[PDB]
From a paper:
Cas12a2 is a CRISPR-associated nuclease that performs RNA-guided, sequence-nonspecific degradation of single-stranded RNA, single-stranded DNA and double-stranded DNA following recognition of a complementary RNA target, culminating in abortive infection. However, it was recently discovered that Cas12a2 from Sulfuricurvum sp. Cas12a2 adopts a bilobed architecture, with a recognition (REC) lobe comprising the REC1 and REC2 domains and the nuclease (NUC) lobe consisting of the PI, wedge (WED), RuvC nuclease, ZR and Cas12a2-specific insertion domains. To understand the unique mechanisms of activation, substrate capture and indiscriminate nuclease activity underlying the function of Cas12a2, we carried out biochemical, structural and in vivo analyses, including determining cryo-electron microscopy (cryo-EM) structures of autoinhibited Cas12a2–crRNA (binary complex) associated with an RNA target (ternary complex) and bound to both an RNA target and a dsDNA collateral substrate mimetic (quaternary complex).
To gain insights into the function of Cas12a2, we first purified a binary complex consisting of catalytically active Cas12a2 and a mature crRNA and determined the structure using cryo-EM to a global resolution of 3.2 Å. The quality of the map allowed de novo modelling of most of Cas12a2, aside from the flexible PFS-interacting (PI) and ZR domains. Of note, seven nucleotides of pre-ordered crRNA sit at the interface between REC1 and REC2 in a conformation in which bases are solvent-exposed and primed for target recognition. This region is towards the 3′ end of the crRNA, and the intervening sequence between the 5′ crRNA stem–loop and this pre-ordered guide is disordered in our structure, probably owing to flexibility. In the binary complex (Cas12a2–crRNA), the active site is occluded. The 3′ end of the crRNA is a pre-ordered seed, and the PI domain is flexible.
Residue numbers in the entry: 5 to 481, 487 to 506, 530 to 615, 706 to 1173, 1212 to 1232
RNA sequence: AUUUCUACUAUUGUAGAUCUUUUUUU
């Protein structure tokens, strides 16, 4: 089952030596130099923790309010596929982030309504709106979490004695950084103008004023406030990029000044310096007045103008993502201007203004000569078209004068214009009947108006089969309806034929596009040469202590690469490894450098960073992590385990008030080495080939079919077992191993730890003794643990007591394991939710008079049966239960939206136990799989039901916020499990990722076929069921939950594991 | 006590887990 694909890992190592007692001194051969380098790097690591917790809370509260406002506004607009339009560069970014093949788009501004093309059964616009919908749901989750944290934090600051409620500042930092990434992922595209609203000038205030206000917002303040907090967090516990080191000396000697002249040429093609010099120094309002004071037609028809000025005189078109910032820097620095005063000017080109909003705002300062030709033309044309059938607020004289100037004749008196007005009015009336969400009851009035409008249309020119469209539209009031309606739309939109202006904009836009694509390409190739900022080599002293000697790649001066490699000889005590590769193309070359050479290099200004790990630097240096094993296997020199030449070294600053012993009290650098597992046994599937396969659907279908054919042939004839993993009401998960005939197999021996103190304190150890024997594992509290004799055993962590205050060796263990009481409280929460579903009234009655916590517990004991442990109602989570019942109260107040209530009934309370319990479960499943010599099948639930049917919009990649199952009885039985959909889907995906890359002994095995990781659960929906309703995926067998139910095992919730394993046994036998 | 996560012990720590361009049009 050897892996034929190239795999990658990112091995991360520390780089700040922990000078402490109770930590073995390491890297002490060159320790002196290490110290110097550290105090060099602190000189660059800037920090000012001066922001008191009060001011941090002030900034956080303001940011939360702004983010909530923006999020509420955006929640109503992401799905407007008819108004949104993304630029080409951002469209490609979408097609990478969301996963769809971009196709070939003819236009620069790709309106989402024009992405009618299909891709694997869904429109291309549905992929984008689904990606935005998922982003919004995650924003909601993190806003809720961050609001709770901020509330507890400021409550703690209020009552100075109540410091116990201060949230863990680690989680505070991490939650805000995740929330800021989510928010910025949409605020940035709106801020710089990639997500645009091109129909903004035709729109009317009233029913669509919210969209206009959202199109005209200023996201400078919100973005700057998020930036303020991100800096504040990066100054007290936040990771902040330090360098990107390369280990190849041919990637470090490139000159980045090759492209310079070229870029300047393109800049002189845009006459940008003149524009920026003319505009810099003005405020945004002054720039607006300058642009609104230009002569529009004269500048547009003036061919000697820069294409930017002419475009802004025709249309609001922003400068792209990818050039703007680098262009501001590249314009400022040669000329000595302020960088920000130029970025402001480049932000001021393409700022949307709506003529209608301006006119409603003030009726005296209005004038149509302010706006570009297209915007003013659209406003005048559609307002004049609407004025023939409704009374509107704008005075027709200026619009008529504008159109008369454009065409040279009275536009409102042409038959073509009246025909356009009639078609538009018919479209407006048809829109009401085609919005089935809010159907009225006065259909007769609309139909009478529609008939009269069709009757009174006087066709200005001979148009063919128009009456066919008329009769179809009348007949419907269904596919023929849409066809005729769209053909009427084509005829209506073609009535403006003005064609001279658009013909000129053809050439203007072609030049504006070619020049900016040349700039973008030159910048992209320039910023992959200035990305690397150091050249480093790994160094081993005599005790296998590895340091990284990194020298600055000064672009302002000759670099030191030649002075590092002129000290590497063949006879010296320190070994040096440096990588040489080109993309059988890799070499890890070793030389030696003496101590005087390192001394001179470091005094010259280079950096020396220890590479620290718990196993690399322990007193016996036995490797027990996988990262340490891979570290010591990379430097064996082989080619099947490769080191990627460049890696990013970062750092995080200390948190105030933490002890220096803790890793959060120390300025901690981090190296991020990158390793490739590339086979040599034949033609390995290159990563590009993997990507191409992942894009193709049929390649995947053939691949999965052939892989499970390999498995079935290589395993069916041999003696194998079936490992069925199932959820549980009381047990988080449950594992049963059946024989291929169906008999229950396995007698697992569960152990128990105990720390025995030795007379010499340095040799204390945990002594494992057998405590239980079981044949159905309770995967909640187990963990696979290595005895000091070398054996691997399964221990039950709930059987051992822990200590109240840690680091009290003299005291005796009293408390209960924290994960155990977390699962206790999780079962209580599940009980509460199942009680809400059936007795929402008996749940809401719990808070009749704001009961005190003792009274709240007394009332809870009425509804929810106790856990059944030693102590009844021991660790009841009164706080979380109270803030879930109050949330249900708030939902049922504002109406009784069933979906909004299921957002609470199915909250998946196990989401903080996820990362910790799934690791244990993966460890145990790996242990049992490798116990039976990899000749075993895995048998898992198929969560596909929770993603609705084929009709539903959920393709699988994005988790539903609420389960979309059709049954109510089954959806109720799946809402009582400890592991929600998110938790159990996370476990399943982690297990598949684990099976894809099993490392048995210095080798990599594979049992699931080319599972594309970034696509969460489509890989399982897309599979083909056998005729027994089980989806085979390599070793794994995804079994539908509902169709696994039979006579109970002769031999409560372990029979579930037995029944999944038994159904897989039966299906596998019936296969052959 | 940690590259980091989780549960710990006080064992100079332990156990599992860990990545080219292309406008106006529905």
């Amino acid at each position: 089952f050897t892996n034929q694909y190239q795999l990658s890992k990112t091995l991360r190592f520390g780089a700040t030596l922990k000078e402490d007692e109770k930590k073995c001194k390491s890297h002490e051969e060159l320790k002196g130099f290490v110290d110097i380098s550290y105090e060099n790097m602190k000189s660059s690591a800037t920090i000012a923790e001066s922001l008191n917790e009060n001011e941090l809370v002030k900034k956080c509260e303001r940011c939360y309010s702004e983010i909530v406002k923006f999020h509420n506004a955006w929640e109503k607009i992401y799905y407007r596929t008819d108004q949104i339009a993304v630029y080409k560069d951002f469209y490609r970014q979408l097609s990478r982030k969301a996963r769809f093949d971009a196709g070939k788009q003819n236009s620069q501004l790709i309106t989402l309504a024009s992405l009618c093309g299909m891709y694997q059964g869904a429109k291309l616009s549905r992929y984008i709106t689904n990606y935005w919908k998922d982003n919004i749901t995650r924003q909601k989750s993190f806003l809720k979490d961050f609001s709770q944290q901020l509330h507890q934090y400021t409550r703690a600051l209020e009552k100075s004695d109540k410091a116990h409620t201060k949230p863990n500042l680690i989680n505070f930092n991490k939650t805000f950084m995740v929330l800021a990434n989510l928010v910025n992922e949409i605020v940035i595209p709106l801020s710089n103008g990639a997500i645009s609203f091109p129909n903004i000038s035709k729109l009317e205030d009233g029913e669509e004023s919210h969209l206009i206000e959202f199109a005209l917002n200023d996201y400078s303040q919100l973005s700057e406030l998020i930036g303020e907090l991100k800096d504040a967090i990066a100054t007290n516990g936040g990771y902040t990029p330090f360098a990107k080191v390369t280990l190849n000396h041919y990637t470090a000697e490139q000159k980045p000044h090759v492209f310079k002249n070229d870029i300047d040429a393109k800049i002189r093609e845009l006459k940008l310096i003149g524009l920026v010099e003319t505009l810099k120094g003005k405020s945004s309002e002054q720039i607006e007045e300058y642009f609104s004071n230009l002569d529009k037609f004269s500048t547009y028809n003036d061919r000697n103008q820069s294409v930017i000025v002419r475009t802004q005189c025709f249309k609001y078109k922003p400068i792209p993502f990818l050039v703007k910032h680098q262009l501001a820097k590249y314009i400022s620095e040669p000329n000595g201007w302020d960088e920000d005063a130029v970025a402001k000017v480049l932000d001021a080109v393409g700022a949307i203004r709506s003529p209608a909003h301006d006119y409603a705002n003030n009726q005296e300062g209005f004038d149509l000569n302010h706006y570009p030709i297209k915007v003013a033309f659209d406003y005048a044309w559609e307002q004049l078209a609407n004025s023939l059938y409704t009374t509107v607020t704008f005075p027709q004289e200026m619009c008529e004068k504008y159109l008369n100037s454009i065409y040279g004749c009275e536009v409102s008196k042409e038959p073509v214009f009246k025909f356009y007005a009639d078609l538009l009015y018919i479209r407006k009336n048809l829109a009401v009947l085609e919005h089935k969400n809010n159907l009225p009851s006065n259909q007769e009035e609309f139909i009478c108006k529609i008939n009269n409008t069709f009757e009174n249309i006087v066709l200005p020119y001979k148009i063919s089969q128009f009456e066919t469209y008329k009769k179809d539209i009348l007949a419907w009031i269904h596919k023929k309806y849409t066809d005729a309606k769209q053909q009427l739309g084509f005829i209506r939109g073609g009535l403006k034929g003005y064609t001279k202006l658009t013909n000129e904009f053809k050439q203007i836009s072609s030049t504006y596009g070619k020049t900016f694509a040349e700039l973008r390409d030159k910048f992209k190739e320039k910023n992959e040469i200035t990305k690397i900022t150091h050249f480093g080599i790994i160094i081993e002293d005599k005790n296998r202590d590895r340091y990284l000697l990194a020298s600055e790649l000064k672009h302002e001066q000759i670099n030191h690469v030649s002075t590092i490699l002129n000290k590497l000889d063949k006879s010296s005590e320190f070994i040096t490894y440096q990588v040489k590769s080109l993309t059988k193309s890799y070499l890890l070359q070793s030389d030696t450098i003496s101590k005087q050479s390192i001394a001179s290099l470091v005094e010259g200004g280079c950096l020396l960073l220890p590479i620290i790990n718990q196993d690399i630097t322990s007193k016996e240096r036995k490797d027990k992590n996988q990262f340490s094993k891979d570290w010591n296997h990379i430097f064996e020199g082989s080619k099947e385990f490769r080191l990627h030449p460049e890696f990013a070294v970062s750092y995080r600053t200390p948190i105030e008030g933490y002890p220096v012993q803790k890793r959060y009290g120390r300025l901690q650098f981090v190296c991020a080495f990158n390793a490739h597992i590339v086979p040599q046994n034949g033609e390995f599937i290159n990563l590009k080939k993997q990507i191409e396969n992942f894009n193709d659907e049929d390649v995947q279908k053939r691949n999965v079919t052939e892989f499970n054919k390999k498995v079935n042939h290589a395993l069916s004839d041999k003696e194998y077992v079936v490992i069925g993993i199932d959820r549980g009401l009381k047990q988080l998960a449950t594992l049963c191993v059946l024989d291929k005939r169906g008999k229950i197999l396995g007698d697992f021996e569960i152990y128990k730890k105990e720390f025995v103190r030795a007379e010499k304190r340095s040799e204390s150890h945990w002594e494992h003794t057998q405590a239980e024997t079981r044949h159905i594992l309770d995967l909640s509290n187990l963990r696979v643990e290595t005895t000091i004799e070398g054996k691997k055993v399964l221990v039950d962590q709930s059987l051992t007591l822990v200590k109240k205050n840690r680091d009290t060796p003299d005291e005796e263990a009293t408390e209960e394991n924290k994960q155990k009481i977390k699962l206790k409280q999780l079962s209580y929460i599940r009980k509460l939710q199942h009680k809400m579903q059936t007795n929402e009234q008996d749940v809401l009655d719990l808070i009749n008079n704001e009961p005190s916590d003792e009274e709240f517990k007394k009332r809870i004991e009425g509804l929810i049966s106790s856990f059944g442990e030693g102590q009844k109602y021991a660790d009841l989570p009164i706080n979380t239960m109270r803030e879930m019942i109050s949330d249900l109260q708030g939902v049922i107040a504002r109406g009784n939206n069933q979906t909004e209530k299921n957002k609470i009934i199915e909250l998946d309370a196990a989401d903080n136990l996820k990362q910790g319990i799934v690791a244990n479960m993966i460890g145990i499943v790996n242990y049992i799989f490798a116990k039976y010599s990899y000749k075993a099948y895995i048998s898992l639930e198929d969560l596909s039901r929770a993603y609705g049917g084929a009709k539903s919009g959920y393709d699988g990649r994005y988790l539903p916020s609420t389960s979309q199952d059709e049954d109510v009885d089954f959806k109720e039985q799946q809402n009582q499990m400890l592991a929600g959909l998110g938790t159990y889907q996370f476990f399943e995906m982690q297990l598949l990722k684990k099976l894809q890359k099993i490392q048995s002994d210095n080798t990599v095995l594979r049992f699931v076929p080319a599972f594309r990781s970034a696509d969460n659960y489509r890989n399982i929906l897309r599979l083909e069921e056998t005729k027994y309703k089980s989806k085979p995926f390599g070793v794994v067998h995804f079994i539908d939950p509902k169709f696994t139910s039979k006579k109970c095992p002769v031999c409560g919730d372990d029979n579930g594991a037995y029944h999944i394993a038994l159904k897989s046994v039966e299906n596998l036998i019936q296969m052959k």
